[PDB]
Structures are given as structure tokens and as C-alpha cells.
């Protein structure tokens with residue numbers, strides 16, 4: 361299959377640059393162009409530039425003075441560099457192939473979430489949410505972390521159905537989220553329910569068993 | 574730059590109904606090489622965009638035949654002959670004919686369904702958190718439809734805006750419902766002063782507010 365694998369930082373200081381490497385498998389960079397697009401809540405989807413198969417580039421003029429795209433065809437890698445990032449350059453950055461004519465290699469990378477901020481990396485506090493005194497809802501509160509993202513699973517993946525992991529929101533300049541799981545009232549506490557929270561940025565992995573009272 | 578004006582911004586549709594999304598370009602979008610690079614994308618919740626339609630009307634590899642594209646000049650249309658649950662998400666048009674290449678603002682497809690009342694659950698601060706000096710009270714409002722819901726927090730009856738944080742899931746693909754969490758964050762010292770904490774919810778499904786609460 362076609363796959364575009366990105367690597368780059370999750371957190372960038374304001375005024376510093378952002379470098380991302382896109383490693384392509386499944387098609388030749390000697391034949392096909394690769395594009396760079398970002399997505400933000402403020403500005404939606406923005407096309408930033410393209411590097412064509414022969415190495416010529418076109419850029420979006422709103423970014424050209426601080427944007428460079430280069431590549432190495434033999435390593436199937438494309439290199440994106442944007443300088444002087446501001447807080448509103450916070451976005452998911454994608455490499456992709458798009459704007460196709462006769463080929464079928466129109467695929468997007470997984471995206472690189474980039475937060476532009478001077479705030480320091482902070483781990484989450486993970487707190488079990490059990491009821492106070494048919495189906496029973498349990499939860500985990502993942503509080504006070506920076507930057508995004510974290511991942512949350514329940515009994516290591518085995519509880520998929522009836523889970524809701526909510527988007528993070530900002531409070532006191534840090535992120536907070538919760539996740540809920542709904543299991544039958546017969547099954548808890550008789551069978552164990554545990555949330556697994558990972559926050560790579562702070563090397564945090566926490567398993568929190570939800571215990572009654 | 575070519576402006577891509579996408580309408581409507583919000584498209585509620587019943588499963589199995591037809592849906593169409595319009596994209597109007599501010600200029601013509603024929604590339605120098607003759608091709609009209611109008612593409613349609615679907616971005617499902619949590620995913621990268623995926624190509625559905627390319628060069629106006631060509632279905633991309635693996636795309637179901639319920640999707641189709643048409644248009645010319647400055648007027649382009651995506652049609653879904655019959656909408657399925659997996660079609661929910663945000664659709665974008667894109668022109669790659671004139672640099673800089675540009676996207677529409679997006680159309681959020683929402684699946685209509687029967688009204689569903691929220692399952693509301695309230696959770697006191699954990700003993701772990703209280704030991705550490707904080708106090709958050711969490712309220713989940715799960716599996717409701719339609720999306721609009723209002724939550725209010727009462728501490729011994731006094732209304733509290735400060736430190737209330739609300740968050741919503743995108744529409745759930747398996748039953749077309751929404752979920753919401755509401756967290757009231759207090760100091761442990763303030764939490765320890767009151768007994769009565771209330772999560773109050775109003776929704777289309779009930780004229781009387783849905784109240785859940787506990788005592789410290």
C-alpha cells in the first residue's frame with residue numbers, strides 16, 4: 361500500500377522553526393508531486409506548497425517568505441521547513457498527494473500536530489471516577505497536561521463499545537479531558553475496569569483502576 | 574486567490590436520503606494543461622481527509638458509487654445518492670488549478686435520528702485528587718439527540734460559571750448520538766465548605782430539567 365509517514369516536533373517555541381520529514385512508500389517521488397497542507401480551527405484547511413517530481417516548487421504566497429520544501433528521491437523523503445512560527449501557526453501539518461490526473465496515489469500522511477507556545481511540558485494527573493453512593497458509567501479525569509495529545513483506552517482496548525473520550529479543553533493554560541465507559545451494572549466491581557492514559561510528551565503512562573466508594 | 578464558497582455549512586440528513594453539497598469558485602479553475610482540478614474530500618472524525626472525487630466527476634479508487642461529482646465553470650456539486658451512517662463528517666471541496674491551491678470552508682454532514690434523552694452521571698472528586706489539594710466534579714451527559722443541550726451547575730443552589738469546563742464528542746457513527754462532559758473545578762477548601770453539588774441539564778427531550786447531584 362501507499363503510506364506517508366511523518367516525523368516532527370509536537371511543541372515549538374514562538375519564533376522558532378518547524379521541521380517535518382515525510383517518508384513516502386508505495387510510489388516514486390521521481391514521478392509524483394507531494395503537497396503540504398495544514399488544518400487549524402482558526403483558519404480551516406490551508407494549502408502551503410508542493411514539490412513536483414523534478415524538484416521545482418510552488419508555494420502559497422502568504423507563507424513563501426518563511427517556507428521551504430526540499431526532498432531526496434533516493435530516500436523517498438520530503439522535507440518541510442517553516443520559520444518564525446507564531447501561536448496561530450498551531451495546526452495539524454500534513455504531507456499528501458492530491459490534485460491527481462491519471463494516477464491513484466492520492467493519500468495523506470497521519471498529520472503532525474504542532475503546538476506553538478512558550479508554556480512548558482507538563483504531565484497529566486489521572487484520577488479515577490467512580491460513582492457516589494442496569495448499566496453503570498465509570499470514568500477517568502486526565503487533568504492539567506501540556507501539550508496535546510494524550511491517548512486513553514479502557515482495560516487496554518477490550519472496552520471499546522460504550523466509551524466516550526472527550527476533546528481536551530484549556531483551563532489555567534493546561535489541558536483537561538475526561539473519558540467515560542458504560543458497562544452493565546452486574547459486571548462492576550465484579551470485573552475490573554481500568555483506564556490507561558499515555559502522554560508521550562512527558563513520558564507518562566498511567567493505569568488507574570476504578571475502585572468503588 | 575480563488576475563493577471556494579461551500580454551501581451549506583451544515584447538512585442534516587436522514588439515513589437513506591439524498592444529499593448535495595455545492596461549491597462555487599470565485600474564478601474559473603481550468604489548469605494550463607486543460608484539467609479542472611476540482612476535488613472533493615471527506616474528513617471523518619479523528620481522521621485525515623480522504624479523496625472521494627477528482628477532476629470534478631471521477632470517483633477515486635475504492636469510493637462507493639453512491640458518491641458522484643458534477644459541474645463546470647464556477648459551479649460544482651457533490652451528490653450522495655443515499656446517505657449512510659459512515660458518510661458523517663466534514664466534506665471539503667478543493668481547487669488545484671491556480672496557485673495558491675484553496676479549500677472550501679467545509680460542510681458538516683449530520684445524521685438525523687429520533688430524539689434520545691441523555692444518560693446523566695455525576696462524579697465527586699476522587700480521594701486521590703482531594704489529597705493533592707484540588708476538587709473537580711465531573712458530569713457526563715451521554716448518548717443524546719439532537720445535539721443542543723444546556724448544563725448548569727449549582728453549589729448549594731448558588732449558580733457557578735467560574736471553573737466550569739464543557740466538552741462534546743462529534744456525532745457517534747454507530748447510533749448517531751452526541752455526548753457531553755461538564756467538569757466543575759473548585760479548590761479542595763471551597764469544595765469542603767459545601768455539601769450539595771448539582772449537575773442540571775435541559776434538552777428537547779424533557780421540558781423539566783434533568784437534575785443529578787450528590788452530598789459530600
Ligand SMILES: N[C@H]1[C@@H](OP(=O)(O)O)O[C@H](CO[C@@H]2O[C@H](CO[C@]3(C(=O)O)C[C@@H](O[C@]4(C(=O)O)C[C@@H](O)[C@@H](O)[C@@H]([C@H](O)CO[C@]5(C(=O)O)C[C@@H](O)[C@@H](O)[C@@H]([C@H](O)CO)O5)O4)[C@@H](O)[C@@H]([C@H](O)CO)O3)[C@@H](OP(=O)(O)O)[C@H](O)[C@H]2N)[C@@H](O)[C@@H]1O
Pocket residue numbers: 391392393394412413414415416417459460461462463606
Ligand atoms: N507540453 C508540455 C511540455 O512541454 P516541453 O516538451 O516543450 O517542455 O512540458 C512542459 C513543462 O516542462 C517540463 O517540466 C518537467 C518537470 O516539471 C516540473 C517538475 O517536475 O519539477 C513541474 C512543472 O509544473 C507543471 C508544468 O508547468 O508543466 C505545472 C504543475 O501545476 C503540475 O501540473 C506539473 C506536473 O505536470 C505535475 O506532475 C504530476 C503530479 O505531480 O501531479 C505527476 C506526473 O507524473 C503526471 O501524472 C502529471 C499530470 O499529467 C498532470 O500534468 O501530474 O507541471 C514545472 O514547474 C517544471 C519546471 O518548469 C521545469 O523547470 O518542473 C520536465 O521533466 P523532468 O526534468 O524530467 O522533471 C520536462 O522535461 C519538461 N518538458 C509543460 O508545461 C507543457 O505543457
Ligand SMILES: *[C@@H]1O[C@H](CO[C@@H]2O[C@@H](C)[C@@H](O)[C@@H](O)[C@@H]2O)[C@@H](O)[C@H](O)[C@H]1NC(C)=O
Pocket residue numbers: 422446447448449
Ligand atoms: C496571527 O497570525 C498573524 C499573521 O497571519 C497571517 O498574516 C496576517 C496579516 C493575516 O493576513 C492572516 O490571514 C495570515 O494568516 C501574525 O502576524 C500574528 O503575530 C499571529 N498572532 C498570534 C497570536 O499568533
Ligand SMILES: [Cl-]
Pocket residue numbers: 588656657658659
Ligand atoms: Cl448505513
